[PDB]
Write a protein that binds this DNA or RNA. Structure first.
Ligand SMILES: Nc1nc2c(ncn2[C@H]2C[C@H](O)[C@@H](COP(=O)(O)OP(=O)(O)OP(=O)(O)O)O2)c(=O)[nH]1
Ligand SMILES: [Ca+2]
Ligand SMILES: [Mn+2]
Ligand SMILES: [Mn+2]
Length: 430
DNA sequence: ATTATGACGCT
DNA sequence: AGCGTCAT
Protein backbone atom coordinates (compact mmCIF):
# COMPACT_ATOMS: atom_id res chain seq x y z
CA UNK A 1 0.00 0.00 0.00
CA UNK A 2 1.29 3.44 1.01
CA UNK A 3 4.52 2.04 2.51
CA UNK A 4 5.19 -0.37 -0.37
CA UNK A 5 8.23 1.07 -2.14
CA UNK A 6 7.79 1.18 -5.91
CA UNK A 7 11.37 1.79 -7.08
CA UNK A 8 10.54 5.10 -8.75
CA UNK A 9 13.08 7.30 -6.94
CA UNK A 10 15.61 7.63 -9.75
CA UNK A 11 15.73 8.42 -13.44
CA UNK A 12 18.31 6.19 -15.16
CA UNK A 13 19.21 6.02 -18.83
CA UNK A 14 21.25 3.55 -20.82
CA UNK A 15 22.88 4.93 -24.00
CA UNK A 16 24.20 2.32 -26.45
CA UNK A 17 25.94 3.08 -29.73
CA UNK A 18 24.31 1.44 -32.75
CA UNK A 19 26.51 -1.26 -34.36
CA UNK A 20 29.43 0.65 -32.87
CA UNK A 21 32.54 -0.72 -34.60
CA UNK A 22 30.69 -0.53 -37.94
CA UNK A 23 29.86 3.13 -37.34
CA UNK A 24 33.50 3.87 -36.51
CA UNK A 25 34.56 2.30 -39.82
CA UNK A 26 31.74 4.03 -41.74
CA UNK A 27 32.79 7.42 -40.40
CA UNK A 28 36.33 6.77 -41.58
CA UNK A 29 35.33 5.31 -44.97
CA UNK A 30 32.25 6.99 -46.52
CA UNK A 31 32.02 4.21 -49.10
CA UNK A 32 30.72 1.94 -46.32
CA UNK A 33 27.93 4.29 -45.21
CA UNK A 34 24.31 3.14 -45.62
CA UNK A 35 25.48 -0.28 -46.82
CA UNK A 36 25.22 -3.83 -45.54
CA UNK A 37 28.56 -4.04 -43.85
CA UNK A 38 30.31 -5.81 -41.02
CA UNK A 39 33.56 -5.62 -39.05
CA UNK A 40 35.74 -8.74 -38.95
CA UNK A 41 38.80 -9.87 -37.00
CA UNK A 42 41.45 -11.70 -39.07
CA UNK A 43 40.79 -13.10 -42.53
CA UNK A 44 42.54 -16.38 -43.32
CA UNK A 45 40.14 -18.71 -41.46
CA UNK A 46 36.68 -18.66 -43.09
CA UNK A 47 37.12 -15.00 -44.06
CA UNK A 48 37.48 -13.74 -40.49
CA UNK A 49 35.01 -13.65 -37.62
CA UNK A 50 32.32 -10.98 -37.64
CA UNK A 51 32.02 -8.92 -34.47
CA UNK A 52 29.70 -6.08 -35.57
CA UNK A 53 26.95 -5.82 -38.20
CA UNK A 54 25.19 -2.86 -39.79
CA UNK A 55 21.39 -2.92 -39.63
CA UNK A 56 21.22 -3.22 -43.43
CA UNK A 57 23.31 -6.41 -43.17
CA UNK A 58 21.23 -7.71 -40.24
CA UNK A 59 18.22 -7.72 -42.57
CA UNK A 60 19.97 -10.50 -44.56
CA UNK A 61 20.59 -12.58 -41.44
CA UNK A 62 24.20 -11.51 -40.89
CA UNK A 63 25.10 -11.75 -37.19
CA UNK A 64 28.01 -11.46 -34.78
CA UNK A 65 29.99 -14.72 -34.25
CA UNK A 66 29.44 -15.62 -37.93
CA UNK A 67 32.34 -16.33 -40.26
CA UNK A 68 32.60 -13.82 -43.09
CA UNK A 69 32.50 -16.56 -45.75
CA UNK A 70 29.14 -17.73 -44.38
CA UNK A 71 27.83 -14.19 -44.08
CA UNK A 72 28.67 -13.70 -47.77
CA UNK A 73 26.46 -16.67 -48.55
CA UNK A 74 23.56 -14.81 -46.91
CA UNK A 75 24.56 -11.39 -48.29
CA UNK A 76 26.81 -11.52 -51.37
CA UNK A 77 27.17 -7.71 -51.45
CA UNK A 78 28.20 -7.47 -47.78
CA UNK A 79 31.04 -5.00 -47.30
CA UNK A 80 33.70 -5.77 -44.73
CA UNK A 81 36.12 -3.72 -42.67
CA UNK A 82 38.93 -5.48 -40.80
CA UNK A 83 40.15 -4.69 -37.31
CA UNK A 84 43.73 -3.42 -37.34
CA UNK A 85 46.45 -5.98 -36.64
CA UNK A 86 49.51 -4.98 -34.63
CA UNK A 87 52.26 -7.23 -33.25
CA UNK A 88 50.47 -10.25 -34.71
CA UNK A 89 47.13 -9.66 -33.01
CA UNK A 90 43.92 -7.72 -33.33
CA UNK A 91 44.31 -4.21 -31.95
CA UNK A 92 41.14 -2.40 -30.88
CA UNK A 93 42.65 1.05 -30.22
CA UNK A 94 40.56 2.86 -32.86
CA UNK A 95 37.34 1.77 -31.17
CA UNK A 96 38.56 2.53 -27.65
CA UNK A 97 39.47 6.06 -28.75
CA UNK A 98 36.08 6.52 -30.42
CA UNK A 99 34.47 5.29 -27.19
CA UNK A 100 36.32 7.95 -25.20
CA UNK A 101 34.92 10.59 -27.62
CA UNK A 102 31.36 9.54 -26.86
CA UNK A 103 31.85 9.07 -23.12
CA UNK A 104 33.31 12.56 -22.78
CA UNK A 105 30.25 14.07 -24.49
CA UNK A 106 27.87 12.10 -22.28
CA UNK A 107 29.74 13.23 -19.16
CA UNK A 108 28.77 16.86 -19.93
CA UNK A 109 25.15 16.05 -19.11
CA UNK A 110 25.57 13.84 -16.04
CA UNK A 111 27.99 11.52 -14.30
CA UNK A 112 28.15 8.25 -16.21
CA UNK A 113 29.00 4.60 -15.61
CA UNK A 114 30.96 3.06 -18.49
CA UNK A 115 29.31 -0.32 -18.84
CA UNK A 116 31.07 -1.40 -22.02
CA UNK A 117 33.12 0.04 -24.92
CA UNK A 118 29.86 1.25 -26.49
CA UNK A 119 27.48 1.94 -23.62
CA UNK A 120 27.02 3.94 -20.49
CA UNK A 121 24.43 4.37 -17.78
CA UNK A 122 23.39 7.90 -16.79
CA UNK A 123 21.81 8.94 -13.49
CA UNK A 124 19.54 11.80 -14.59
CA UNK A 125 17.66 12.29 -11.31
CA UNK A 126 19.29 15.63 -10.46
CA UNK A 127 19.37 16.94 -14.06
CA UNK A 128 15.64 16.13 -14.25
CA UNK A 129 14.90 18.08 -11.07
CA UNK A 130 16.84 21.07 -12.45
CA UNK A 131 15.05 20.97 -15.79
CA UNK A 132 11.66 20.67 -14.07
CA UNK A 133 12.38 23.80 -12.05
CA UNK A 134 13.65 25.61 -15.17
CA UNK A 135 10.44 24.60 -16.95
CA UNK A 136 8.12 26.18 -14.32
CA UNK A 137 5.19 23.88 -15.04
CA UNK A 138 4.58 24.14 -18.78
CA UNK A 139 3.82 20.78 -20.43
CA UNK A 140 6.31 18.91 -22.58
CA UNK A 141 5.79 19.24 -26.31
CA UNK A 142 6.01 16.15 -28.49
CA UNK A 143 8.50 18.18 -30.54
CA UNK A 144 11.00 17.76 -27.70
CA UNK A 145 10.75 13.95 -28.03
CA UNK A 146 11.21 13.43 -31.79
CA UNK A 147 12.74 9.93 -31.54
CA UNK A 148 11.07 8.62 -28.36
CA UNK A 149 8.83 5.55 -28.09
CA UNK A 150 6.62 5.03 -25.04
CA UNK A 151 6.57 1.31 -24.31
CA UNK A 152 3.02 -0.09 -24.15
CA UNK A 153 1.42 2.73 -26.10
CA UNK A 154 -0.68 3.36 -28.04
CA UNK A 155 -3.36 1.19 -26.46
CA UNK A 156 -7.08 0.74 -27.00
CA UNK A 157 -8.96 3.00 -29.49
CA UNK A 158 -2.20 3.64 -37.91
CA UNK A 159 -0.43 1.98 -40.84
CA UNK A 160 3.13 3.41 -40.61
CA UNK A 161 5.74 3.04 -37.88
CA UNK A 162 6.41 6.75 -37.27
CA UNK A 163 2.66 7.26 -36.96
CA UNK A 164 2.39 4.54 -34.31
CA UNK A 165 5.29 6.13 -32.44
CA UNK A 166 3.57 9.53 -32.49
CA UNK A 167 0.19 8.10 -31.44
CA UNK A 168 1.76 6.43 -28.43
CA UNK A 169 3.65 9.58 -27.54
CA UNK A 170 0.47 11.65 -27.77
CA UNK A 171 -1.41 9.27 -25.46
CA UNK A 172 1.47 9.43 -22.99
CA UNK A 173 1.74 13.20 -22.98
CA UNK A 174 -2.02 13.69 -22.80
CA UNK A 175 -2.08 11.57 -19.65
CA UNK A 176 0.72 13.57 -17.94
CA UNK A 177 0.25 15.68 -14.79
CA UNK A 178 2.80 18.48 -15.28
CA UNK A 179 1.95 20.28 -12.01
CA UNK A 180 3.49 17.56 -9.79
CA UNK A 181 7.28 17.96 -9.64
CA UNK A 182 7.42 14.55 -7.91
CA UNK A 183 5.38 12.55 -10.45
CA UNK A 184 7.62 9.65 -11.60
CA UNK A 185 6.06 9.57 -15.07
CA UNK A 186 6.80 13.27 -15.50
CA UNK A 187 10.34 12.75 -14.24
CA UNK A 188 10.91 9.98 -16.79
CA UNK A 189 9.52 12.21 -19.54
CA UNK A 190 11.92 15.04 -18.67
CA UNK A 191 14.68 12.44 -18.55
CA UNK A 192 13.79 11.44 -22.09
CA UNK A 193 13.94 15.11 -23.18
CA UNK A 194 17.47 15.31 -21.77
CA UNK A 195 18.46 12.03 -23.46
CA UNK A 196 17.21 13.38 -26.80
CA UNK A 197 19.57 16.31 -26.25
CA UNK A 198 22.45 14.00 -25.26
CA UNK A 199 21.93 11.80 -28.33
CA UNK A 200 21.75 14.86 -30.59
CA UNK A 201 25.03 16.12 -29.12
CA UNK A 202 26.71 12.74 -29.66
CA UNK A 203 25.61 12.60 -33.30
CA UNK A 204 26.48 16.25 -34.00
CA UNK A 205 29.95 16.02 -32.47
CA UNK A 206 31.00 12.49 -33.53
CA UNK A 207 28.80 11.40 -36.43
CA UNK A 208 27.69 8.37 -34.40
CA UNK A 209 24.08 7.37 -33.80
CA UNK A 210 22.88 5.63 -30.69
CA UNK A 211 19.81 4.25 -29.05
CA UNK A 212 18.78 4.71 -25.46
CA UNK A 213 16.46 3.52 -22.73
CA UNK A 214 14.96 5.70 -20.00
CA UNK A 215 13.46 4.14 -16.88
CA UNK A 216 13.83 4.05 -13.10
CA UNK A 217 16.81 1.70 -12.86
CA UNK A 218 19.64 0.16 -14.84
CA UNK A 219 17.96 -3.15 -15.78
CA UNK A 220 14.82 -1.47 -17.12
CA UNK A 221 16.83 1.19 -18.94
CA UNK A 222 18.94 -1.49 -20.66
CA UNK A 223 15.84 -3.48 -21.57
CA UNK A 224 14.14 -0.33 -22.85
CA UNK A 225 17.14 0.59 -24.98
CA UNK A 226 16.79 -2.69 -26.89
CA UNK A 227 13.09 -2.26 -27.69
CA UNK A 228 13.49 0.19 -30.60
CA UNK A 229 16.82 0.08 -32.39
CA UNK A 230 18.47 1.68 -34.21
CA UNK A 231 18.65 5.44 -33.64
CA UNK A 232 15.65 5.63 -31.29
CA UNK A 233 15.01 5.86 -27.57
CA UNK A 234 12.38 4.15 -25.44
CA UNK A 235 10.74 5.18 -22.19
CA UNK A 236 9.71 2.27 -19.92
CA UNK A 237 7.46 3.53 -17.14
CA UNK A 238 6.85 1.73 -13.87
CA UNK A 239 3.25 1.21 -14.99
CA UNK A 240 4.35 -0.48 -18.20
CA UNK A 241 6.13 -3.29 -16.34
CA UNK A 242 3.24 -5.78 -15.74
CA UNK A 243 2.29 -6.01 -19.42
CA UNK A 244 5.89 -5.84 -20.64
CA UNK A 245 6.99 -8.61 -18.31
CA UNK A 246 3.92 -10.79 -18.87
CA UNK A 247 5.40 -12.14 -22.13
CA UNK A 248 9.12 -11.33 -21.48
CA UNK A 249 11.28 -14.49 -21.60
CA UNK A 250 13.37 -14.57 -18.44
CA UNK A 251 16.62 -14.71 -20.49
CA UNK A 252 16.05 -11.21 -21.88
CA UNK A 253 16.79 -9.53 -18.53
CA UNK A 254 20.44 -8.65 -17.97
CA UNK A 255 22.19 -11.31 -15.80
CA UNK A 256 19.52 -13.96 -16.53
CA UNK A 257 20.69 -15.03 -19.98
CA UNK A 258 22.89 -17.86 -18.67
CA UNK A 259 22.80 -20.72 -16.18
CA UNK A 260 20.93 -18.84 -13.43
CA UNK A 261 18.11 -17.87 -15.78
CA UNK A 262 17.93 -21.45 -17.06
CA UNK A 263 17.63 -22.62 -13.45
CA UNK A 264 14.82 -20.15 -12.71
CA UNK A 265 12.96 -21.59 -15.71
CA UNK A 266 13.61 -25.21 -14.77
CA UNK A 267 13.15 -25.07 -11.00
CA UNK A 268 10.05 -22.87 -11.02
CA UNK A 269 8.51 -24.21 -14.22
CA UNK A 270 7.90 -20.74 -15.64
CA UNK A 271 8.83 -18.94 -18.87
CA UNK A 272 8.24 -15.21 -18.39
CA UNK A 273 9.51 -12.53 -16.04
CA UNK A 274 6.03 -11.68 -14.85
CA UNK A 275 5.44 -15.22 -13.56
CA UNK A 276 8.03 -14.58 -10.87
CA UNK A 277 5.60 -12.35 -8.99
CA UNK A 278 3.76 -15.40 -7.67
CA UNK A 279 6.64 -16.53 -5.43
CA UNK A 280 7.53 -15.13 -2.05
CA UNK A 281 10.86 -13.49 -1.43
CA UNK A 282 11.80 -16.41 0.84
CA UNK A 283 10.84 -18.93 -1.85
CA UNK A 284 13.09 -17.23 -4.37
CA UNK A 285 15.95 -16.91 -1.86
CA UNK A 286 15.58 -20.61 -1.04
CA UNK A 287 16.09 -21.58 -4.66
CA UNK A 288 18.59 -18.96 -5.85
CA UNK A 289 20.34 -17.63 -2.76
CA UNK A 290 19.66 -14.65 -0.54
CA UNK A 291 21.06 -12.03 -2.93
CA UNK A 292 19.63 -13.42 -6.17
CA UNK A 293 16.33 -14.20 -4.47
CA UNK A 294 15.87 -10.64 -3.21
CA UNK A 295 16.98 -9.25 -6.56
CA UNK A 296 14.49 -11.40 -8.49
CA UNK A 297 11.66 -10.61 -6.08
CA UNK A 298 12.15 -6.88 -6.65
CA UNK A 299 13.06 -7.04 -10.31
CA UNK A 300 9.99 -8.91 -11.49
CA UNK A 301 8.04 -5.92 -10.04
CA UNK A 302 10.22 -3.44 -11.94
CA UNK A 303 12.38 -2.54 -8.92
CA UNK A 304 16.17 -2.61 -8.82
CA UNK A 305 18.57 -0.60 -6.71
CA UNK A 306 22.04 -1.04 -8.26
CA UNK A 307 23.56 2.46 -8.44
CA UNK A 308 25.00 4.14 -11.47
CA UNK A 309 28.63 4.16 -10.38
CA UNK A 310 30.68 7.30 -11.13
CA UNK A 311 33.21 5.53 -13.31
CA UNK A 312 34.03 6.67 -16.85
CA UNK A 313 37.26 4.68 -17.21
CA UNK A 314 37.83 0.91 -17.39
CA UNK A 315 39.10 -0.69 -14.17
CA UNK A 316 41.44 -3.04 -16.04
CA UNK A 317 43.52 -2.86 -19.20
CA UNK A 318 44.06 -6.26 -20.83
CA UNK A 319 45.52 -7.96 -23.92
CA UNK A 320 44.51 -11.45 -25.01
CA UNK A 321 44.98 -13.80 -27.92
CA UNK A 322 43.65 -17.27 -28.73
CA UNK A 323 45.81 -19.84 -30.51
CA UNK A 324 43.23 -22.30 -31.83
CA UNK A 325 43.72 -25.79 -33.19
CA UNK A 326 47.10 -26.19 -34.87
CA UNK A 327 48.45 -22.71 -34.08
CA UNK A 328 48.70 -23.49 -30.34
CA UNK A 329 52.08 -22.58 -28.87
CA UNK A 330 54.27 -25.66 -28.43
CA UNK A 331 57.79 -24.24 -27.92
CA UNK A 332 59.32 -22.02 -25.25
CA UNK A 333 60.47 -19.57 -27.93
CA UNK A 334 56.89 -19.26 -29.20
CA UNK A 335 55.38 -18.71 -25.76
CA UNK A 336 58.00 -16.08 -24.98
CA UNK A 337 57.58 -14.29 -28.32
CA UNK A 338 53.81 -14.00 -27.91
CA UNK A 339 54.02 -12.96 -24.26
CA UNK A 340 56.32 -10.22 -25.47
CA UNK A 341 53.88 -9.14 -28.20
CA UNK A 342 51.03 -8.92 -25.70
CA UNK A 343 53.26 -7.11 -23.21
CA UNK A 344 54.33 -4.54 -25.79
CA UNK A 345 50.71 -3.75 -26.60
CA UNK A 346 49.94 -3.57 -22.88
CA UNK A 347 52.89 -1.21 -22.22
CA UNK A 348 51.72 1.16 -24.98
CA UNK A 349 48.15 1.23 -23.66
CA UNK A 350 49.29 1.59 -20.05
CA UNK A 351 51.67 4.43 -20.81
CA UNK A 352 48.93 6.27 -22.67
CA UNK A 353 46.53 5.57 -19.78
CA UNK A 354 48.99 6.97 -17.23
CA UNK A 355 49.44 10.20 -19.20
CA UNK A 356 45.70 10.65 -19.83
CA UNK A 357 44.22 9.56 -16.53
CA UNK A 358 46.81 10.18 -13.78
CA UNK A 359 46.93 6.61 -12.50
CA UNK A 360 49.21 3.57 -12.49
CA UNK A 361 48.33 -0.11 -12.46
CA UNK A 362 49.98 -2.13 -9.71
CA UNK A 363 49.04 -5.77 -10.41
CA UNK A 364 49.63 -7.93 -13.48
CA UNK A 365 47.30 -10.88 -14.04
CA UNK A 366 48.51 -13.67 -16.34
CA UNK A 367 45.97 -16.11 -17.70
CA UNK A 368 46.40 -19.07 -20.01
CA UNK A 369 44.42 -21.91 -21.51
CA UNK A 370 45.94 -25.32 -22.22
CA UNK A 371 44.87 -27.58 -25.07
CA UNK A 372 41.99 -29.86 -24.10
CA UNK A 373 40.48 -27.67 -21.37
CA UNK A 374 37.03 -26.38 -22.29
CA UNK A 375 37.13 -23.55 -19.73
CA UNK A 376 37.88 -20.01 -20.90
CA UNK A 377 40.86 -19.77 -18.53
CA UNK A 378 42.93 -22.76 -17.44
CA UNK A 379 45.04 -20.75 -15.00
CA UNK A 380 45.17 -17.22 -13.58
CA UNK A 381 48.15 -15.98 -11.57
CA UNK A 382 48.94 -12.48 -10.37
CA UNK A 383 52.28 -10.79 -9.81
CA UNK A 384 53.45 -7.29 -9.00
CA UNK A 385 53.44 -4.68 -11.78
CA UNK A 386 56.11 -2.19 -10.72
CA UNK A 387 57.33 -0.79 -14.06
CA UNK A 388 55.65 -0.21 -17.42
CA UNK A 389 58.25 -2.24 -19.28
CA UNK A 390 57.17 -4.88 -21.78
CA UNK A 391 60.27 -7.06 -21.43
CA UNK A 392 59.96 -7.12 -17.63
CA UNK A 393 56.23 -7.77 -17.83
CA UNK A 394 56.67 -10.66 -20.29
CA UNK A 395 59.52 -12.17 -18.26
CA UNK A 396 57.38 -11.96 -15.09
CA UNK A 397 54.42 -13.55 -16.87
CA UNK A 398 56.65 -16.36 -18.13
CA UNK A 399 57.96 -16.86 -14.59
CA UNK A 400 54.49 -17.15 -13.10
CA UNK A 401 53.35 -19.62 -15.80
CA UNK A 402 56.49 -21.69 -16.49
CA UNK A 403 55.43 -24.34 -13.96
CA UNK A 404 52.58 -25.18 -16.34
CA UNK A 405 54.95 -26.77 -18.86
CA UNK A 406 54.66 -30.50 -18.14
CA UNK A 407 57.22 -31.31 -20.84
CA UNK A 408 60.50 -32.68 -19.58
CA UNK A 409 62.24 -31.08 -22.56
CA UNK A 410 63.32 -27.51 -21.87
CA UNK A 411 62.46 -26.26 -25.37
CA UNK A 412 59.08 -27.88 -25.95
CA UNK A 413 55.91 -26.60 -24.31
CA UNK A 414 53.25 -29.20 -23.54
CA UNK A 415 50.38 -29.35 -23.44
CA UNK A 416 50.35 -26.56 -26.05
CA UNK A 417 48.89 -23.20 -25.08
CA UNK A 418 45.69 -22.08 -26.80
CA UNK A 419 45.32 -18.68 -25.12
CA UNK A 420 47.49 -16.02 -23.51
CA UNK A 421 46.09 -13.09 -21.54
CA UNK A 422 47.83 -10.22 -19.73
CA UNK A 423 45.79 -7.80 -17.66
CA UNK A 424 46.85 -4.74 -15.69
CA UNK A 425 44.70 -4.14 -12.61
CA UNK A 426 44.54 -2.37 -9.22
CA UNK A 427 45.06 1.23 -10.30
CA UNK A 428 46.34 3.92 -7.92
CA UNK A 429 46.34 7.66 -8.44
CA UNK A 430 49.65 9.07 -9.65
C1' DA B 1 38.75 -22.64 -35.33
C1' DT B 2 34.50 -17.70 -32.74
C1' DT B 3 37.72 -13.69 -30.66
C1' DA B 4 38.90 -9.91 -27.61
C1' DT B 5 37.83 -7.97 -24.00
C1' DG B 6 35.57 -6.21 -19.32
C1' DA B 7 32.69 -6.34 -14.88
C1' DC B 8 31.49 -8.66 -10.88
C1' DG B 9 30.25 -12.73 -7.52
C1' DC B 10 31.94 -16.64 -4.76
C1' DT B 11 34.84 -18.81 -1.39
C1' DA C 1 43.84 -14.81 -4.30
C1' DG C 2 42.09 -17.79 -7.96
C1' DC C 3 37.96 -19.37 -10.15
C1' DG C 4 33.31 -18.93 -12.34
C1' DT C 5 29.54 -16.32 -14.62
C1' DC C 6 27.69 -13.04 -17.74
C1' DA C 7 28.04 -9.93 -21.29
C1' DT C 8 28.81 -10.04 -26.53
N1 LIG D 1 36.41 -8.16 -30.11
C1 LIG D 1 35.10 -8.25 -29.91
N2 LIG D 1 34.35 -7.16 -29.96
C2 LIG D 1 33.05 -7.43 -29.74
C3 LIG D 1 32.46 -8.64 -29.49
N3 LIG D 1 31.09 -8.49 -29.33
C4 LIG D 1 30.88 -7.21 -29.50
N4 LIG D 1 32.03 -6.51 -29.77
C5 LIG D 1 32.19 -5.10 -30.09
C6 LIG D 1 31.72 -4.74 -31.50
C7 LIG D 1 30.45 -3.94 -31.27
O1 LIG D 1 30.29 -2.92 -32.26
C8 LIG D 1 30.68 -3.33 -29.90
C9 LIG D 1 29.43 -2.99 -29.15
O2 LIG D 1 28.66 -4.18 -28.90
P1 LIG D 1 27.07 -4.27 -28.88
O3 LIG D 1 26.75 -5.53 -28.28
O4 LIG D 1 26.48 -3.05 -28.20
O5 LIG D 1 26.52 -4.30 -30.36
P2 LIG D 1 26.56 -3.21 -31.51
O6 LIG D 1 26.87 -1.87 -30.98
O7 LIG D 1 27.51 -3.72 -32.54
O8 LIG D 1 25.09 -3.33 -32.08
P3 LIG D 1 23.73 -2.75 -31.48
O9 LIG D 1 23.22 -1.70 -32.32
O10 LIG D 1 24.11 -2.26 -30.12
O11 LIG D 1 22.81 -3.95 -31.38
O12 LIG D 1 31.40 -4.34 -29.18
C10 LIG D 1 33.26 -9.78 -29.44
O13 LIG D 1 32.90 -10.92 -29.21
N5 LIG D 1 34.59 -9.50 -29.67
CA1 LIG E 1 25.75 -1.07 -29.33
MN1 LIG F 1 26.60 -2.24 -26.07
MN1 LIG G 1 25.20 -6.18 -30.21
Amino acid sequence: GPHMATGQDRVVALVDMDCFFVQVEQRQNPHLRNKPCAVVQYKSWKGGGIIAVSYEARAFGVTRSMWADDAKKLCPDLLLAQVRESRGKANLTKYREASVEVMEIMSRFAVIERASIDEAYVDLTSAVQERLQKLQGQPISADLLPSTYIEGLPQGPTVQKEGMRKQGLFQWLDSLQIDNLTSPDLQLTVGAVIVEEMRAAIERETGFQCSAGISHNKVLAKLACGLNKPNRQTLVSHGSVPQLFSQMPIRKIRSLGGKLGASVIEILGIEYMGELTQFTESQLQSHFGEKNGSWLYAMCRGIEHDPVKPRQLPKTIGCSKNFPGKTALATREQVQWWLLQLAQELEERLTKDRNDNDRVATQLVVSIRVQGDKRLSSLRRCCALTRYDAHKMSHDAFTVIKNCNTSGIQTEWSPPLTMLFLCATKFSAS
